Structure 1
């Protein structure tokens, strides 16, 4: 019913493995070792039932460049509810915890959604990015057309022109 927030460095090895395995199975294989690396470093929202982790979402810190400013961003990764626990709105409890972190620490939240999860985020006030997305790669700005149509943002202490360019910072694997 309610998620508990734990920083990566506060996860014991057993809990870390339990999280990785649950998230990985929830994605049915579509979750790579670099996707797992992207869930580390920040706050994990976790819901347990009788000692088993049944839901997870992580919010990690990065910068998103918007109109020349490198905005302090809480980026959401690894959102997953164990299959047998789906359809009980557990994801709402995960997102209440992640959005609380955003309000207290960041200028905006952001994330990359599948087409079917778009409704979930929009219903909570997240906004679909309509402008071109890019990544500040080591060679300079590079457009990321495969991620267009997947980015959502949650403004905290700003109004955003969601049809402007948005440029994430660099990492391996999927940059968004």
Structure 2
């Protein structure tokens, strides 16, 4: 299988719904209205089999502040492979597409991973963040300790001290 990249604005309404339902079912309900909102706005890597969406990952644009610079970041959201199609390395095909988008448009990729998926990201060259994570909330920088240990980055055109602070920009729901 090979993923196809489609911008959110190019999704017909039937396709957009098929994605939301497949991703929601793949997370077994652990995917909220704001998790879905966070998957919108960027490029969706999609894998189909006979007219049905069997795999999805989205890369959206945001800023991550590292050593005072607001790095242009491709943030990965909604990675999911339909349950009956798992164990077939379809996720590797989704990540090939999302990583291609990073190399062509961003300074680094980033994402917040489940304890499970960590081996997968690390095997592809993603780096686990060791420094304290924070978010630039409307009141100012606030640490995000519940997200520590879950963030991974994919440097594109920068070497990174992964034990320095990393502060994402603000949004509703999970900020990472």
Distance 1:116 1:80 in 2: 13
TM-score if structure 1 supplies the norm length? 1.00
Matched residue, 2:118: 118
Structure 2 unaligned blocks of 5 or more: none
- SS class of match (2:131): coil
- SS class of match (1:30): coil
Q: Deviations over 1:127-146 (max 9, x none)?
A: 00000000000000000000
Q: Deviations over 1:48-77 (max 9, x none)?
A: 000000000000000000000000000000
CA shift, 1:40, in A, is 0.1
- SS class of match (2:121): helix
CA shift, 1:99, in A, is 0.1
Distance 1:80 1:115 in 2: 15
**Structural RMSD (CA):** 0.1
Matched residue, 1:100: 100
Q: Which runs of structure 1 show a deviation greater than 6 angstroms over 4 or more consecutive aligned residues? A: none
Distance 1:150 1:29 in 2: 20
Aligned residues: 176
TM-score if structure 2 supplies the norm length? 1.00
Q: Deviations over 1:9-60 (max 9, x none)?
A: 0000000000000000000000000000000000000000000000000000
